[PDB]
């Protein structure tokens, strides 16, 4: 129930999520980086890109964001699995955990509007070239967003339950 | 007579707030009089040039915190030029998020009380307190003619303790971020254990 307990739990989840998406993206590789440029459905959002912008952005705002970003990803995560059926294995893992994290996340907000993902056709693509571009973009984007959430959570924890110490 | 296709061979951020890249003069060609580094960022058409050719030293581009964003790809190129001609490095796609490798830890001290007590500090100019950076540490140590080292992982702690004979120990500590690269080991400290 405690604003503590929860934060501790969130970071634990976020950090674990970012790891899986790394390794999954990593083994997935086995020049696509060129088409991954501007390909993420969260690009639209106003996320802080700096320590200096993260600090300048308050508790409320910062947390809505986090929930949007997480809400945004159950769609693609789900179709990623749906479509797909170790590369299968990790995806089913990420879907669960993000679900638990958004849960813990929605708890935090009570005590203290999100972008749609439409790259589905693109995953079910006739030509193998395009297919792989769309899968690569997906994964690269998830690695990015897992990282960002993790870092944002690690941050707010320090800010609120540790007054920056 | 004209350069010398160059290579941007590494980038590194020591703290997610600034970063630096480095290039090598090219696979044989003439002596480049001048170097140029240009880049763009994703979500942007606008072409930039290195903000800072000095602080990183020889053949380097240093991006201050004013030019550093986490989570955004940088597409980069070095131009090498002569009175005779010029060549362009390959484009380098680089993301600050995945090139984090901190300095080594500072002020490794060892005290000898039934145990020995190791203490260190973060490298300077990391921002740990705020949550932005998260730093894991690790400790190695060895008697003086030992084949193999002994490594003890110490998590986010800035201190640690071992239980051992009457022997001289070299001890080193390194650090990594939650996700990224191990720093280099710090310089060794020495401690004798009495009887």
From Swiss-Prot, chain A:
Phosphoserine modified-residue sites = 14, 22, 72, 110, 133
The terms describing its cellular component in GO are:
endosome lumen; extracellular region; extracellular space
Protein name per the record = Prolactin
Record function comment: Prolactin acts primarily on the mammary gland by promoting lactation.
Q: Which family does it belong to?
A: Belongs to the somatotropin/prolactin family.
Species of origin reads Homo sapiens
Keyword Phosphoprotein tagged: yes
This entry's Gene Ontology molecular function terms read: hormone activity; prolactin receptor binding
Intrachain S-S bonds: 40-141
Q: Does the keyword Secreted apply?
A: yes
Outline the subunit composition. Answer: Interacts with PRLR.
Shown chain mapped onto the complete sequence = 41 to 226 of 227
Q: Which gene encodes it?
A: PRL
Glycosylation site positions: 19
What is the top-level taxon of the source organism? Eukaryota
Q: Where located?
A: Secreted
Q: Supply one GO BP term.
A: female pregnancy
The alphabetical list of record keywords is: Disulfide bond, Glycoprotein, Hormone, Lactation, Phosphoprotein, Secreted, Signal
Curated annotation (Swiss-Prot), chain B:
The UniProt-reported impact of residue 139 to L is: In MFAB; confers constitutive activity
Tissue range of expression?
Expressed in breast, placenta, kidney, liver and pancreas.
Subcellular location per the Swiss-Prot or TrEMBL entry? Membrane
Q: Which residues form the Fibronectin type-III domain?
A: 2-103, 104-195
Subunit-level organization: Homodimer upon hormone binding. Interacts with SMARCA1. Interacts with GH1. Interacts with CSH. Interacts with NEK3 and VAV2 and this interaction is prolactin-dependent.
Pathological condition linked to this protein in its record: Multiple fibroadenomas of the breast: A benign breast disease marked by lobuloalveolar growth with abnormally high proliferation of the epithelium, and characterized by the presence of more than 3 fibroadenomas in one breast. Fibroadenomas are adenomas containing fibrous tissue. Hyperprolactinemia: A disorder characterized by increased levels of prolactin in the blood not associated with gestation or the puerperium. HPRL may result in infertility, hypogonadism, and galactorrhea.
Which family would the database say this protein is a member of?
A: Belongs to the type I cytokine receptor family. Type 1 subfamily.
Comment, domains: The WSXWS motif appears to be necessary for proper protein folding and thereby efficient intracellular transport and cell-surface receptor binding.
Recorded protein name is Prolactin receptor
Q: Which organism encodes this protein?
A: Homo sapiens (Human)
């Amino acid at each position: 129930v405690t604003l503590r307990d929860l934060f501790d739990r969130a970071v634990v989840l976020s950090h674990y999520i970012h790891n899986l998406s790394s390794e999954m993206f990593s083994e997935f590789d086995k020049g696509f980086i060129t088409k991954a440029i501007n390909s993420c459905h969260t690009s639209s959002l106003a996320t802080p890109e700096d320590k200096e912008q993260a600090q300048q952005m308050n508790q409320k705002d910062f947390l809505s964001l986090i929930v949007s970003i997480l809400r945004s990803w159950n769609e693609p995560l789900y179709h990623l699995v749906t479509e797909v059926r170790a590369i299968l294995s990790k995806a089913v893992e990420i879907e669960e955990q993000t679900k638990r994290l958004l849960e813990r996340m929605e708890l935090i907000v009570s005590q203290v509007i999100y972008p749609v993902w439409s790259g589905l056709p693109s995953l079910q693509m006739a030509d193998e070239e395009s297919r792989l571009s769309a899968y690569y973009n997906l994964l690269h984007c998830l690695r990015r967003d897992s990282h960002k959430i993790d870092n944002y959570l690690k941050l707010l924890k320090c800010r609120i339950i540790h007054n920056n110490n | 007579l004209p350069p010398g296709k160059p290579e941007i061979f590494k980038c590194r951020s020591p703290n997610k707030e600034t970063f630096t890249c480095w290039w090598r003069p090219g696979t044989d060609g003439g002596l480049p009089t001048n170097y140029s580094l240009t880049y763009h960022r994703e979500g942007e058409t606008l072409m930039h040039e290195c903000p800072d050719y000095i602080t990183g030293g020889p053949n380097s581009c240093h991006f201050g915190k004013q030019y550093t964003s986490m989570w955004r790809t940088y597409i980069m190129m070095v131009n090498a030029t002569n009175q005779m001609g010029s060549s362009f490095s390959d484009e380098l796609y680089v993301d600050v998020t995945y090139i984090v490798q901190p300095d080594p830890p500072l002020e490794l001290a060892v005290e000898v009380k039934p145990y020995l007590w190791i203490k260190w500090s973060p490298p300077t100019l990391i921002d740990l307190k705020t949550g932005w950076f998260t730093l894991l540490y690790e400790i190695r140590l060895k008697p003086e003619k030992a084949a193999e080292w002994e490594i003890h992982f110490a998590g986010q702690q800035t201190e640690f303790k071992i239980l051992s004979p009457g022997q001289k120990y070299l001890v080193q500590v390194r650090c990594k971020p939650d996700h990224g690269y191990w720093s280099a080991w710090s310089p060794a400290t020495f401690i004798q254990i009495p009887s």
